[PDB]
Amino acid sequence: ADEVTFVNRFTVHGAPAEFESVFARTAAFFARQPGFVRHTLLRERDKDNSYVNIAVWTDHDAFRRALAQPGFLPHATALRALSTSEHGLFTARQTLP
Amino acid sequence: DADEVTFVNRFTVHGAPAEFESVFARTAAFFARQPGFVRHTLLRERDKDNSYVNIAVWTDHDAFRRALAQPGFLPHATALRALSTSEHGLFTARQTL
Ligand SMILES: [Cl-]
């Protein structure tokens, strides 16, 4: 299978510190799932309420098994309370180096 | 500031995706010769032919800006403008695992 990259754009409606806490707990959850490779949370420079998360998984099935975990639900609910999300699943076509 | 910057550029490709990808490879190689270039990833949305995201990391904003100001960037920018629409943002990494 090929690696998949999940890209999630967040518009944060409450306090960014609270969002980062909730996000940190979400990321720790995913980080102990089989097939998790890496993640980066990015904050937009000219804004205070704009974030993008990039998460890499070994394959599509590992990503969906993680998302299907009942243990994700509290994290999904908390994130939904604090933010509007637009997400997509991608594959990498070029990487340099 | 002196913070590492991550440039996120979302593209809708209206010409041939193969031509878009080829132009991008040459664009990335140009950037790879620029001081302060860290890494480049071109992502394609799964089961869309026409939706891409470039993630480009630079040691700081000034190194990025200077790269975009080089005369050598112009042919690449010109080719991308012929083939795609795009929306960009500049970000700083907040969390990583
Ligand atoms: Cl990442």
CATH number at residue B51: 3.30.70.100
C-alpha pair distances (Å), A45 with each of A35, B31, B90, B96: 31, 21, 6, 17
Of B24, B90, B95, the CB nearest to A41: B95
- If you search the block for the tokens 């102990």, which residue do you land on? A32
Backbone angles phi, psi at B36, to 5 degrees: 90, -10
Q: Does B53 touch chain A (CB under 8 A)?
A: yes
Q: What is the Å distance from ligand 1's center to A17 Cα?
A: 21
Domain count along chain B? 1
For chain A, report the end-to-end CA distance as a whole number of angstroms.
22
Q: Indicate the DSSP class of residue A35.
A: T
Q: Does A24 touch chain B (CB under 8 A)?
A: yes
Helix, strand, coil % (nearest 5) of chain B?
A: 40, 40, 20
Smallest Cα distance from B55 to chain A, Å: 10
Experimental method used, please? X-ray
Task: Check: CB of residue A13 under 8 Å from CB of residue A83.
Answer: yes
In whole angstroms, what is the distance from residue B86 CA to residue B47 CA?
19
Residue type, A87: H
Q: Give the residue among A92, A95, A69 at the shortest CA–CA distance from A4.
A: A92
Smallest Cα distance from A26 to chain B, Å: 12
Which residue of chain B is at minimal alpha-carbon distance from A29? B97
Resolution reading in Å: 1.7
Q: Under an 8 A CB cutoff, do A52 and B24 touch?
A: no
Of B8, B53, B95, the CB nearest to A24: B95
In whole angstroms, what is the distance from residue B70 CA to residue B65 CA?
9
Smallest Cα distance from B85 to chain A, Å: 18
Q: Give the residue among B36, B76, B75 at the shortest CA–CA distance from B56.
A: B36
Range of the domain at B21: 1-97
Q: What is the Å distance from ligand 1's center to A42 Cα?
A: 10
Q: Under an 8 A CB cutoff, do A40 and B6 touch?
A: yes
